[PDB]
Enzyme design. Sequence first.
Site, PDB file in Angstrom:
ATOM      1  N   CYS A 195      42.513  32.565  51.652  1.00 54.99           N
ATOM      2  CA  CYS A 195      42.282  33.400  50.571  1.00 54.99           C
ATOM      3  C   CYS A 195      42.965  32.818  49.322  1.00 54.99           C
ATOM      4  O   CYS A 195      43.333  31.820  49.438  1.00 54.99           O
ATOM      5  CB  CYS A 195      42.297  34.800  50.856  1.00 54.99           C
ATOM      6  SG  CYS A 195      44.165  35.174  51.412  1.00 54.99           S
ATOM      7  N   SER A 196      43.238  33.751  48.294  1.00 58.15           N
ATOM      8  CA  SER A 196      44.180  33.170  47.090  1.00 58.15           C
ATOM      9  C   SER A 196      45.367  32.648  47.595  1.00 58.15           C
ATOM     10  O   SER A 196      45.762  31.363  47.533  1.00 58.15           O
ATOM     11  CB  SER A 196      43.988  34.189  46.013  1.00 58.15           C
ATOM     12  OG  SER A 196      44.546  35.240  46.380  1.00 58.15           O
ATOM     13  N   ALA A 197      46.465  33.514  47.776  1.00 60.97           N
ATOM     14  CA  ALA A 197      47.723  33.209  48.307  1.00 60.97           C
ATOM     15  C   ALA A 197      47.731  32.931  49.779  1.00 60.97           C
ATOM     16  O   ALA A 197      48.942  32.275  50.131  1.00 60.97           O
ATOM     17  CB  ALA A 197      48.519  34.281  47.762  1.00 60.97           C
ATOM     18  N   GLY A 198      46.763  33.064  50.723  1.00 57.24           N
ATOM     19  CA  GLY A 198      46.746  32.885  52.339  1.00 57.24           C
ATOM     20  C   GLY A 198      47.524  33.532  52.719  1.00 57.24           C
ATOM     21  O   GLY A 198      48.067  33.082  53.857  1.00 57.24           O
ATOM     22  N   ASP A 206      36.634  45.298  47.444  1.00 54.64           N
ATOM     23  CA  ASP A 206      37.309  45.894  46.537  1.00 54.64           C
ATOM     24  C   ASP A 206      38.057  47.179  46.928  1.00 54.64           C
ATOM     25  O   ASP A 206      39.347  47.512  47.063  1.00 54.64           O
ATOM     26  CB  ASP A 206      36.830  46.026  45.056  1.00 54.64           C
ATOM     27  CG  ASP A 206      35.659  46.655  44.873  1.00 54.64           C
ATOM     28  OD1 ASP A 206      34.718  46.742  45.810  1.00 54.64           O
ATOM     29  OD2 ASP A 206      35.650  47.648  43.879  1.00 54.64           O
ATOM     30  N   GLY A 232      47.027  37.813  52.260  1.00 53.07           N
ATOM     31  CA  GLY A 232      46.337  39.151  52.076  1.00 53.07           C
ATOM     32  C   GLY A 232      44.992  39.165  52.982  1.00 53.07           C
ATOM     33  O   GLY A 232      45.289  40.095  53.992  1.00 53.07           O
ATOM     34  N   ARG A 233      44.027  38.696  52.398  1.00 52.77           N
ATOM     35  CA  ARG A 233      42.755  38.507  53.475  1.00 52.77           C
ATOM     36  C   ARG A 233      42.737  37.761  54.445  1.00 52.77           C
ATOM     37  O   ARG A 233      42.296  38.012  55.528  1.00 52.77           O
ATOM     38  CB  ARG A 233      41.681  38.079  52.128  1.00 52.77           C
ATOM     39  CG  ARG A 233      41.776  38.719  50.979  1.00 52.77           C
ATOM     40  CD  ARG A 233      40.456  38.068  50.203  1.00 52.77           C
ATOM     41  NE  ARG A 233      40.558  38.841  48.722  1.00 52.77           N
ATOM     42  CZ  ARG A 233      39.942  38.603  47.768  1.00 52.77           C
ATOM     43  NH1 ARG A 233      38.706  37.660  47.777  1.00 52.77           N
ATOM     44  NH2 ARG A 233      39.977  39.285  46.581  1.00 52.77           N
ATOM     45  N   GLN A 274      48.905  41.891  52.923  1.00 52.49           N
ATOM     46  CA  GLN A 274      49.694  42.019  51.555  1.00 52.49           C
ATOM     47  C   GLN A 274      49.672  43.620  51.290  1.00 52.49           C
ATOM     48  O   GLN A 274      50.761  43.851  50.904  1.00 52.49           O
ATOM     49  CB  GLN A 274      49.387  41.399  50.639  1.00 52.49           C
ATOM     50  CG  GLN A 274      50.387  41.126  49.563  1.00 52.49           C
ATOM     51  CD  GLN A 274      50.083  40.063  48.524  1.00 52.49           C
ATOM     52  OE1 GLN A 274      49.059  39.457  48.602  1.00 52.49           O
ATOM     53  NE2 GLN A 274      50.999  39.815  47.646  1.00 52.49           N
TER      54      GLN A 274
HETATM   55  O1  LIG Z   1      41.584  42.417  48.967  1.00 48.42           O
HETATM   56  P1  LIG Z   1      42.587  42.116  47.572  1.00 48.42           P
HETATM   57  O2  LIG Z   1      42.189  40.759  47.192  1.00 48.42           O
HETATM   58  O3  LIG Z   1      43.823  42.880  47.587  1.00 48.42           O
HETATM   59  C1  LIG Z   1      41.940  43.297  46.195  1.00 48.42           C
HETATM   60  O4  LIG Z   1      41.406  44.349  46.660  1.00 48.42           O
HETATM   61  C2  LIG Z   1      40.442  42.684  45.725  1.00 48.42           C
HETATM   62  C3  LIG Z   1      40.214  42.129  44.630  1.00 48.42           C
HETATM   63  C4  LIG Z   1      39.044  41.694  44.004  1.00 48.42           C
HETATM   64  C5  LIG Z   1      37.850  41.777  44.917  1.00 48.42           C
HETATM   65  C6  LIG Z   1      36.617  41.462  44.313  1.00 48.42           C
HETATM   66  C7  LIG Z   1      36.387  40.188  43.706  1.00 48.42           C
HETATM   67  C8  LIG Z   1      35.331  39.883  43.156  1.00 48.42           C
HETATM   68  C9  LIG Z   1      34.198  40.773  43.221  1.00 48.42           C
HETATM   69  C10 LIG Z   1      34.229  41.993  43.936  1.00 48.42           C
HETATM   70  C11 LIG Z   1      32.984  43.008  44.043  1.00 48.42           C
HETATM   71  O5  LIG Z   1      32.216  42.628  43.133  1.00 48.42           O
HETATM   72  C12 LIG Z   1      32.596  43.058  45.553  1.00 48.42           C
HETATM   73  C13 LIG Z   1      32.394  42.010  46.428  1.00 48.42           C
HETATM   74  C14 LIG Z   1      31.854  41.979  47.653  1.00 48.42           C
HETATM   75  C15 LIG Z   1      32.055  43.342  48.255  1.00 48.42           C
HETATM   76 CL1  LIG Z   1      31.607  43.517  49.782  1.00 48.42          CL
HETATM   77  C16 LIG Z   1      32.390  44.446  47.632  1.00 48.42           C
HETATM   78 CL2  LIG Z   1      32.312  46.060  48.164  1.00 48.42          CL
HETATM   79  C17 LIG Z   1      32.736  44.235  46.112  1.00 48.42           C
HETATM   80  C18 LIG Z   1      35.489  42.319  44.656  1.00 48.42           C
HETATM   81  C19 LIG Z   1      37.973  42.369  46.165  1.00 48.42           C
HETATM   82  C20 LIG Z   1      39.194  42.837  46.284  1.00 48.42           C
END
Ligand SMILES: O=P(O)(O)[C@H](O)c1ccc(-c2cccc([C@@H](O)c3ccc(Cl)c(Cl)c3)c2)cc1
Length: 287
Positions: A222-225, A187, A227-228, A266
């Site tokens: 990933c969700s929208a395919g 995150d 970003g990640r 993204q």
């Molecule tokens: O990259 P995006 O999609 O734009 C956005 O920033 C985003 C959104 C949500 C998450 C996320 C979802 C569920 C759990 C955790 C959270 O508990 C977590 C899970 C694994 C790790 Cl390694 C970390 Cl540090 C934190 C995080 C991660 C990144």
Amino acid sequence: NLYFQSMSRVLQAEELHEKALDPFLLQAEFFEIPMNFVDPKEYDIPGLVRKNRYKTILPNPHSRVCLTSPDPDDPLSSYINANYIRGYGGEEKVYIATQGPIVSTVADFWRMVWQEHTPIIVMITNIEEMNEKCTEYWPEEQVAYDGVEITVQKVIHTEDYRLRLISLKSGTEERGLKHYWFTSWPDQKTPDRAPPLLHLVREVEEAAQQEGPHCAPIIVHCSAGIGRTGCFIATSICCQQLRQEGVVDILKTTCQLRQDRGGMIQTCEQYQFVHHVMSLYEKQLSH
Ligand SMILES: O=P(O)(O)[C@H](O)c1ccc(-c2cccc([C@@H](O)c3ccc(Cl)c(Cl)c3)c2)cc1
């Protein structure tokens, strides 16, 4: 430079190191990259709404994966929100970038797998994000979709991913498939979160080499395919670029990605994350 003017910024080791830690230069560079999104009105297909997780994240028509079985002339049956993605040096169809399947697209996703002879799937969805960011499209043991028997033969649990060794059988032909479910997507995209993504990229690129000559497309979602998925693919390309050329061009790799599928990488935090991943890999290679 077919869909927009590409950009380039060739980073040697020292600049790469500094660039990853300069968010002001990163955001200035990132927000000049054209998204190359599709106008949603480009697709006028009755029932298309049910095929897309997000109405505004659509596959670019020129690189769109068309499902040619059972009807290539039916715009709905042939549709999947997915695009062929060029790899390092512009190699055609190294990957397929796609949205995380939804209930109404589970069977379509398997049609894509079968049509493409896909040996590897990279799923970048966290455990807590199931089932709103991705529907569980694999069976607990076995399932049949459109004449393909899909069997999960083994579940290998690692610290940062769950690897499923799958069998695909239709008639007499049997194929293997590696499903890598990555569970450590951060995150907060700080440098200390770069090692699990780097390990995954390296695991998948060695597994793609083991397929031998002219590896079929690797499905990344990933969700929208975008970003990640964009991050994983840019990291994979630049890892090959650094070993071959001794430099990285995340900027030109991101442009190459956006030409194939709009929105690839993204966010600026994702852009910076790819720089943290490449800076780390460079340090690791140096030894
Ligand atoms: O990259 P995006 O999609 O734009 C956005 O920033 C985003 C959104 C949500 C998450 C996320 C979802 C569920 C759990 C955790 C959270 O508990 C977590 C899970 C694994 C790790 Cl390694 C970390 Cl540090 C934190 C995080 C991660 C990144």
